[PDB]
Write a protein that binds this ligand. Structure first.
Ligand code: N62
Ligand code: CL
Ligand code: CL
Length: 138
């Protein structure tokens, strides 16, 4: 129901206690999904489910500074399934983004970009039907 890629403004950036919720459905033959929490051209937090990286499924997380990708953080727990509805929740904590999918904790990503209040856009891209993208303070 939403156009992909989708740009969700985060007015005044993010802050601890901010909860971002993404609802959608993975497409049948999916290859990749991405959520990009952006500070201008920088990507503070790139969350990238990969359905076929050397014939394994993995989540790659990273940061892009001055157009250069940094050290990737991988996690092999992979809760997405092609063709299935998902909920990603990203809770901003003091020292990390905390990600839960379908109400189960998945991973944490320490803040490399420190200017939380300047991470003012979330890009949602890839092989999904996007249902909703929203935020709230908890
Ligand atoms: O390309 C790979 N690695 C280099 C880069 O790694 C970065 C993280 O360190 C980024 O993931 C970068 O991708 C950027 C990107 C992703 C993207 C996406 F995920 C979408 F769903 C849609 C559009 C996208 O456009 C992009 O530029 C990506 O190009 C890559 C390598 C090896 C693989 F097996 C891959 C499998 C799936 C996807 C990417 C790869
Ligand atoms: Cl910074
Ligand atoms: Cl909202």
């Amino acid at each position: 129901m939403l156009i992909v890629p989708y740009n969700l403004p985060l007015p005044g950036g993010v802050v601890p206690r901010m909860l971002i919720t993404i609802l959608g459905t993975v497409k049948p033959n999916a290859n990749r999904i991405a959520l990009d929490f952006q500070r201008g051209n920088d990507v503070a937090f790139h969350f990238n489910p990969r359905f076929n990286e050397n014939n394994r499924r993995v989540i790659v997380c990273n940061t892009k500074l001055d157009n250069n990708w940094g050290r990737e953080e991988r996690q092999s727990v992979f809760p997405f399934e092609s063709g299935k509805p998902f909920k990603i929740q990203v809770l901003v904590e003091p020292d990390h983004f905390k990600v839960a999918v379908n109400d189960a904790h998945l991973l944490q990503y320490n803040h490399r970009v420190k200017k939380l209040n300047e991470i003012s856009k979330l890009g949602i891209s890839g092989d999904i039907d996007l249902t909703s993208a929203s935020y709230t303070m908890i």
